[PDB]
Amino acid sequence: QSKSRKIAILGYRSVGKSSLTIQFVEGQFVDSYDPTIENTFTKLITVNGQEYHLQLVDTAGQDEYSIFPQTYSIDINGYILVYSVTSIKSFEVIKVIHGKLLDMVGKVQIPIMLVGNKKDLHMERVISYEEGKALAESWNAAFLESSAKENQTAVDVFRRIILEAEKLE
Ligand SMILES: Nc1nc2c(ncn2[C@@H]2O[C@H](COP(=O)(O)OP(=O)(O)O)[C@@H](O)[C@H]2O)c(=O)[nH]1
Ligand SMILES: [Mg+2]
């Protein structure tokens, strides 16, 4: 009598959706992964004594113009929205995505969190921790920063989204 969460991973293009997800499930940082591929990864994690069966949707990517059709919500238990702290564009884009996603959802409390990835690039960082935090807060969302190089930060991210579901249960 375990539970089952299905998580949508959303974000611009080359912000590390795949790399972050793969890191969590394989224990491995990959060099490249094909950015056409939508793939569902699976994983066990135990959270507050409850064994969870995760399905992780590594979406191909979105942008400003992308379209969230009415059906997308259907069987989605949670949404993780990812930008890169090195691409202002990806931060621009994630605000837009959030807007369209919040419209496609309507009223429901199905949790949404926000992640600043690529934190390991001290020299390439353009977005501050504060900047993304303010966004999350503005949405009443969770906010973590991450690195697909670092396993433990990835674990925090997919663990946190489950937590955020549990809050509302
Ligand atoms: N240094 C660093 N590179 C990353 C990180 N996350 C992703 N990358 C790299 O950025 C590119 C995009 O990764 P990917 O997961 O394919 O992004 P996606 O297109 O959103 O799935 C790849 O070249 C990765 O090797 C990170 O946290 N740190
Ligand atoms: Mg990808």
- Tokens 């807060």 belong to residue: 137
Is residue 29 lining ligand 1, measured as CB closer than 6 Å?
no
d(CA 159, CA 7) in angstroms, rounded, equals: 11
**Cβ atoms within 10 Å, residue 46:** 10
d(CA 19, CA 149) in angstroms, rounded, equals: 8
As given in the structure block, the two tokens for residue 9 are 């991973």
Is residue 35 lining ligand 1, measured as CB closer than 6 Å?
yes
> What phi, psi does 26 have (nearest 5°)?
-95, -25
Q: Tabulate helix, strand, coil % of the chain (nearest 5).
A: 35, 25, 40
Which atom of ligand 1 is least distant from the CA of 33?
Answer: 16
> Topology of domain 1-169, per CATH?
Rossmann fold (3.40.50)
Q: What angle do CA 133, 53, 32 make, to 5 degrees?
A: 60
Q: What angle do CA 33, 35, 41 make, to 5 degrees?
A: 65
Nearest to 5 by CA among 144, 109, 161, 148: 161
**Does 16 appear as a known binding residue?**
yes
d(CA 21, CA 95) in angstroms, rounded, equals: 21
In the chain, where are the structural domains located?
1-169
The residue whose C-alpha atom lies closest to atom 8 belonging to ligand 1 is 16
Instruction: Name the β-bridge partners of 39.
Output: 58
Torsion of CA 133, 38, 149, 110, to 10 degrees: 30
Is residue 15 lining ligand 1, measured as CB closer than 6 Å?
yes
